[PDB]
Design a protein around this ligand. Structure first.
Ligand SMILES: Nc1ncnc2c1ncn2[C@@H]1O[C@H](COP(=O)(O)OP(=O)(O)OP(=O)(O)O)[C@@H](O)[C@H]1O
Ligand SMILES: Nc1ncnc2c1ncn2[C@@H]1O[C@H](COP(=O)(O)OP(=O)(O)OP(=O)(O)O)[C@@H](O)[C@H]1O
Lengths: 588, 601
């Protein structure tokens, strides 16, 4: 029932020829100047990047052959519609003008990197690699003019329109550096506006090492903090940087400055906002050699760590030809694993340095850990994230938190079972029929009140090589006569009316068998328990026959009071109208 | 004060020399095979699309009969991926010019329909990402041509030799490198085909078995698609098991080219996925926002011939068109959802009950006022001029308003019975205005961010009651003066209440606007006060001197003064609960139980 035509029937017949690969140049220029970048505004990023490379080469030459400042200069002409950019770097002679700008995929900045020592400072700051970034000017310009003056012993002019030809001629007088003039298109006249160009520079090239002037005014007044020593950075510097990199306006409660040299080069700073996120609403930016690649990174961090803010910079991460994506690499997948373990080991340290501060962190961002244990499919990671979880216990007072490592610490030496009971509040967990069995023979049980706590431990399955298993006055006849009267007035409200001695001050309480049904009600088969020794109960027994219309309101109120005290009713607005009627009839 | 270097000073000296742009071919192939495509798997997509182009060149050629299909074979033992199509094939000249030249595309000179995927001329070189050796056997059409074998290692050179036994078409054999042994697996290759090339207009065979290629339903007439076809297509693009309750098949040619299908799942949206969706295609090939954040519940596919692709075929090149395309789709979905309330209001009442949280998000998280009001047309409330259970909208509220009115009054309550008997509604019934009833949790937060609708201000009932104090309090009680406390008995009672509620209320005043309730708490910005408590204030207690509970409170302060204070604290708590401003209602049960005991003798 199969059908395939691929068969080994071909054989080499005769001799063969030899040819080299070619390249249609006229078509290739159009590819770079159109179908390469998702935005037209990219040309500003590349021309500034090519200028910074020219500035870095001159700085490196002045180390051994030391001899004006550096920095790059821009200018916009809103009338003629021209975008001009000029650096005062190394420049280019006539040979380097025809070789570099005239040949696609040729990058003199790449050959410069391969000739330097790997310890040289310019070896980790040159941006060029491929050799096509310059041709992004033809995407927004009908005519490109380049003036350059080399640092050796005449200036030249490089002019082209992007149609497969260019002209070179002498010029005078060209300043030491390289000047580029872009006669913008009609649909690209927005790039002659000082405001629009300023928006583009602050997006990609805001952290260039050298100063950047726009019509005579400096822009990039911001320094890359992820490149400095974590000790020489003050707290007010991180607070000022977090508001920029995260587009927020508060202070980062946690700050992680990670610097590693084992997988590639990691110069990253992570933040945790102090304000809790909500519905009425950036992420971690990806830089490479101080240039923005992705505003919201996708491959370097897991999904459950998207609440982190900051920036991750890598000098040797495989970049895409568009400089806005990353290549599929085993180095990037291992980078995500190292970062996941570092953030876990970092938040664990904050839980020991300040449990009070970590408890505030787990209340706001605790849902991300519960999301991580469920989403991931690696069991060793599910237990690494579980070390961050916090729960209340049955053998501990209310309001105090403990970890799964603390629970396994206090367990009996002859047992290896983690027992938990996920209930709404504590009044429903302490009065659980499945917990009362674990209160006699068995010992400790975890109380998980937070949302999505059940399926988190259900997807956790195993922790610390151990299983998590969900642990799931009035006479004797005067009460029964009152019981039979309460069941008839509460037919379709509760399913069982009991009498228990544990009440004293409260005339009633609400206990529920299954806690999964208690959450579905809060999205039910309650058990109303009555104290035959309370004042309101003995008044209810005496008013069920003397004033049945008055005892009907009291019964409905005692049930509602037990529902509120049990957390089942948090908005007692429906009872206000009936409660006011009870007070007036009780104050006659 | 300024520092500029650029000055018009350069002048051309001597004549110029003309040159031609050149290309470094050895490094061009290195860029394609390493730094062009972000994911290695796309080499299967490019080779399949090259076979679909060759088959389309034969489809157009057969109309001046042979099988037209694509075959894939995986050899995990020899580490070999083989693709063979029965298309036009290439002669010796085509093998050297089309394949041996970067950026050269024979699928461009073929011009003179819209079923050819080839464009740039570099897609064939995507095989070198995963293969050390590429063998290509091609046979031209019925013509004066023999068979040939195209061979290359991927480094600068290639060899072409004549071959026999070359079937009509083209066969490419990829000797996979050890880095990419995943592509010699049948399961892995089938994942790549169904991802990118699941809508190819030709059959695809993998190791002998025919792959279930689907049909591009977004490129066909809507009136030729049955409900059962939209069911099966929704279960694929959304990867679901249910069926869509709504189906929008929107096509357009102005101002943009749009060929899209949208679905609304009949399942309620999982609350775990809301805090934690529509594909994009082009020429039946998968491409990887397009819809606003509040429309993330919709599932489907959007196609547009006006969206340019990049070289790697994974990026959209017009962020302004994407922003314009997003607004056009938003207005269409708004009209589509508005037409669903007209045809079946009961079904839309279910959809608004399951997805209404998305429409409220799109109103709060939007800066444009007109977008706030366009989405607001989808909201549904109940009116005080309509029977219980009947839903209405802001549009229907605006038509009922008289010529003199200029505001839209609304009231938020848990259910209908509380809104009809709310103390804030009894004060509104003295007016002749219509009041909307909002029962959802985040309805008041939405109407505060909406602010106005159709130049009419949204005023909550609790706010309008506070404003009338600063105007003419020309209202009258529901009971005659014989049933109320006298002015001497009222001031004597008001002074005692200010002393027992010193630091809990700003001031206490009498109001003639209550009938059933003894008191109510009024705050100016009541809507924001309820939102701020979801983590004191300046509240105002307004008593009803005709209520039996207040008249008894005036007498209790002289017969049982401690019982009167416990009652006053309870009236304040009840007025705070009914206002939605109550904190934790559990610590008050103690005083309530103690108050009910002393009252019941
Ligand atoms: N402003 C400038 N001053 C001096 N040299 C320059 C300038 N701009 C470009 N060049 C030279 O021209 C060459 C062409 O660079 P091109 O922009 O084509 O690629 P790249 O910048 O090296 O790398 P990428 O293609 O990744 O941007 C570079 O190697 C560089 O040495
Ligand atoms: N299997 C095949 N049979 C016959 N002709 C082919 C085959 N594959 C490619 N060709 C021809 O050789 C040319 C080589 O094109 P190539 O695959 O390199 O890029 P492209 O598909 O034209 O461009 P892009 O992939 O960027 O759209 C094509 O134009 C096509 O006409």
């Amino acid at each position: 029932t199969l059908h395939n035509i691929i068969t080994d029937t071909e054989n080499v017949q005769g001799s063969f020829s030899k040819h080299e690969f070619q390249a249609e140049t006229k078509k290739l220029l159009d590819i770079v100047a159109r179908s390469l970048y998702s935005e037209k505004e990219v040309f500003i990023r590349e021309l500034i990047s090519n200028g910074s490379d020219a500035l870095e080469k001159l700085r490196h030459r002045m180390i051994t052959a030391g001899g004006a400042p550096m920095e790059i200069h821009l200018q916009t002409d809103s009338v003629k519609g021209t975008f001009t950019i000029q650096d005062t770097g190394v420049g280019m002679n006539k040979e380097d003008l025809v070789s570099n700008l005239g040949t696609i995929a040729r990058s003199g900045s790449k050959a410069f990197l391969d000739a330097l020592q790997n310890q040289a400072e310019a070896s980790s700051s040159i941006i060029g690699q491929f050799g096509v970034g310059f041709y992004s000017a033809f995407m927004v310009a009908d005519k490109v003019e380049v003036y350059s003056q080399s640092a050796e012993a005449p200036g030249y002019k490089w002019s082209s329109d992007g149609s497969g030809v260019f002209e070179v001629a002498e010029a005078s007088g060209v300043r030491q550096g390289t000047k580029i003039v872009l006669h913008l298109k009609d649909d690209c006249k927005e790039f002659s506006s000082e405001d629009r160009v300023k928006e583009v520079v602050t997006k990609y090239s805001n952290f260039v090492s050298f100063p950047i002037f726009l019509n005579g005014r400096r822009l990039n007044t911001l320094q890359a903090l992820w490149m400095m020593e974590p000790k020489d950075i003050s707290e007010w510097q991180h607070e000022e940087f977090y508001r920029y990199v995260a587009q927020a306006y508060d202070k980062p409660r946690y700050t992680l400055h990670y610097r590693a040299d084992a997988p590639l080069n990691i110069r990253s700073i992570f933040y945790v906002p102090e304000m809790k996120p909500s519905m009425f609403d950036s992420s971690v930016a990806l830089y490479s050699r101080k240039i923005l690649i992705q505003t919201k990174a996708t491959d370097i961090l897991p999904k459950w760590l998207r609440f982190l803010r900051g920036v991750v910079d890598s000098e040797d991460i495989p970049l895409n030809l568009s400089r806005e994506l990353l290549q599929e690499s085993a180095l990037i997948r291992k980078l995500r694993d190292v970062l996941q373990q570092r953030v876990i080991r970092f938040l664990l340290d904050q839980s020991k340095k300040d449990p009070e501060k970590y408890a505030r962190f787990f209340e706001d961002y605790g849902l991300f850990m519960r999301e991580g244990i469920v989403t991931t499919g690696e069991q060793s990671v599910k237990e690494d994230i579980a070390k961050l979880l916090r729960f209340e216990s049955s053998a501990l007072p209310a309001g105090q938190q403990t970890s799964l490592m603390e629970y396994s610490s206090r367990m009996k030496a002859g047992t290896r079972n983690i027992y938990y009971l996920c209930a709404p509040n504590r009044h429903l967990a302490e009065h659980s029929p499945y917990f009362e069995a674990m209160k006699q023979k068995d010992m400790e049980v975890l109380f998980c009140f937070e949302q999505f706590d059940e399926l988190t431990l259900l997807h956790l399955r195993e922790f610390d090589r151990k299983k998590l298993i969900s642990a799931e006055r009035l006479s004797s006849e005067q009460a029964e006569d009152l019981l039979a009267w309460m069941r008839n007035a509460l037919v379709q409200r509760v399913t069982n009316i009991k009498v228990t001695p544990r009440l004293d001050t409260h005339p009633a309480m609400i206990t529920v068998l299954e806690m999964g049904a208690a959450r579905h009600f809060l999205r039910l088969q309650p058990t109303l328990e009555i104290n035959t020794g309370h004042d309101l109960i003995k008044k209810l027994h005496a008013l069920k026959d003397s004033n049945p219309e008055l005892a009907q309101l009291l019964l409905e109120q005692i049930y509602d009071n037990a529902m509120i005290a049990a957390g089942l009713n948090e908005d007692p607005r429906p009872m206000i109208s009936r409660l006011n009627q009870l007070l007036t009839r009780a104050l006659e």
